Ligand binder design. Structure first.
Ligand SMILES: c1c[nH]c(-c2ccc3c(c2)OCCO3)c1
Length: 279
C-alpha cells in the first residue's frame, strides 16, 4: 500500500532515505493487534480513528482527553492518515490529567492495569503499550514497566526531552523496555532528545502532524511523538508475524536504518526505525 502526501515521519519509517513523502506499508496494517496508549486519554470520536479507538480506564473524573497529547500520540500509532498501523485497535488508559501531569503511583497502577486488561481484549497478533511520559529516576516506575513487558506486552517508552542522558529518567532508564529517542526530517537527532546507552532506537519526533482534540490536527515535537511511531511499527510487524512482544524492540533495532543520523553522541545507538517494506 502507498499513502501519498504522508506526514514526513511515516514516509521516513518506510524509506532508506530522508526527503520523501509517500508511506509504503503492507496492507495488513496491524489488523488483529492492539496498542494501549497510556497518556491523557484519546478522543475516540475523532473520525481519524474510524471506530478503532476506545477508552478503557481512567483515574480521573472523566476519560476524555482534555489536553490533546494522548490523542496526538494515539493518532501516530493508528489513525487512518497520521498512523503507522492503520488497522490496529487502540485502547486509552488515562493516567495523566488534562494538564498532562500524573502521580507515579497512578502511572504504575495504569501499567499493571494493562498487564491484566490485555486478557480482556482480543489481540491475536499481539499487544503493545506506548508510554509517552516520564519523570525522574524511580526504581518503582522502572519495575512496573519491566512487569508490563514481562507479561507479554511490547513496551515502548519516551527517552525524554532534556537533551541529557536518559539514565536519570523513568521509565526511560528501564533496560527491558524499548526506549525511544527523537530525530528530525533531516536525519538529525532532535535538539531536545535524550540520549545514552539506555536508548534502543530513534523515531521521528520533530514537527509531527497528528490528530488533536476537537476533531482537529496539529504538529508538535517531542520524544512523546517518536515513541508511538515505534509502538505502531511493533504492532505492524507483529501482525506480519515477523516478531513477538518479547523480541520486537531487538528486531526493530536489528532491522533499523543504521548510521544515518547526525549529532548522535558516542555510546548512543545510531538506529532509525524502519519497516523494511518492499512494495
Ligand atoms: C562527535 C562530535 N560531536 C559529538 C557530540 C558530543 C557531545 C554530545 C553530542 C554529540 O550530542 C549531545 C550530547 O553531547 C560527537
Amino acid at each position: 500500500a502507498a499513502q501519498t502526501n504522508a506526514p514526513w515521519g511515516l514516509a521516513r519509517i518506510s524509506s532508506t532515505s530522508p526527503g520523501t513523502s509517500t508511506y509504503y506499508y503492507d496492507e495488513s496494517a496491524g489488523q488483529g493487534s492492539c496498542v494501549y496508549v497510556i497518556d491523557t486519554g484519546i478522543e475516540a470520536s475523532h473520525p481519524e480513528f474510524e471506530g478503532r479507538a476506545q477508552m478503557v480506564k481512567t483515574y480521573y473524573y472523566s476519560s476524555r482527553d482534555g489536553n490533546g497529547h494522548g490523542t496526538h500520540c494515539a493518532g501516530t500509532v493508528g489513525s487512518r492518515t497520521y498512523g503507522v498501523a492503520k488497522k490496529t485497535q487502540l485502547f486509552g488508559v488515562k493516567v495523566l490529567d488534562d494538564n498532562g501531569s500524573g502521580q507515579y503511583s497512578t502511572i504504575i497502577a495504569g501499567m499493571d492495569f494493562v498487564a491484566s486488561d490485555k486478557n480482556n481484549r482480543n489481540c491475536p497478533k499481539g499487544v503493545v503499550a506506548s508510554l509517552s511520559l516520564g519523570g525522574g529516576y524511580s526504581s518503582s516506575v522502572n519495575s512496573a514497566a519491566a512487569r508490563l513487558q514481562s507479561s507479554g506486552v511490547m513496551v515502548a517508552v519516551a527517552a525524554g526531552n532534556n537533551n541529557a542522558d536518559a539514565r536519570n529518567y523513568s521509565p526511560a532508564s528501564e533496560p527491558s523496555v524499548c526506549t525511544v529517542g527523537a530525530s528530525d526530517r533531516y536525519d538529525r537527532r532532535s535538539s531536545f532528545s535524550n540520549y545514552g546507552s539506555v536508548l534502543d532506537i530513534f523515531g521521528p519526533g520533530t514537527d509531527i502532524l497528528s490528530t488533536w482534540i476537537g476533531g482537529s490536527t496539529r504538529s508538535i515535537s517531542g520524544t512523546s511523538m517518536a515513541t508511538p511511531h515505534v509502538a505502531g511499527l511493533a504492532a505492524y510487524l507483529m501482525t506480519l508475524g515477523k516478531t513477538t512482544a518479547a523480541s520486537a524492540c531487538r528486531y526493530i533495532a536489528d532491522t533499523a536504518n543504521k548510521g544515518d543520523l547526525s549529532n548522535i553522541p558516542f555510546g548512543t545507538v545510531n538506529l532509525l526505525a524502519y519497516n523494511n517494506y518492499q512494495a
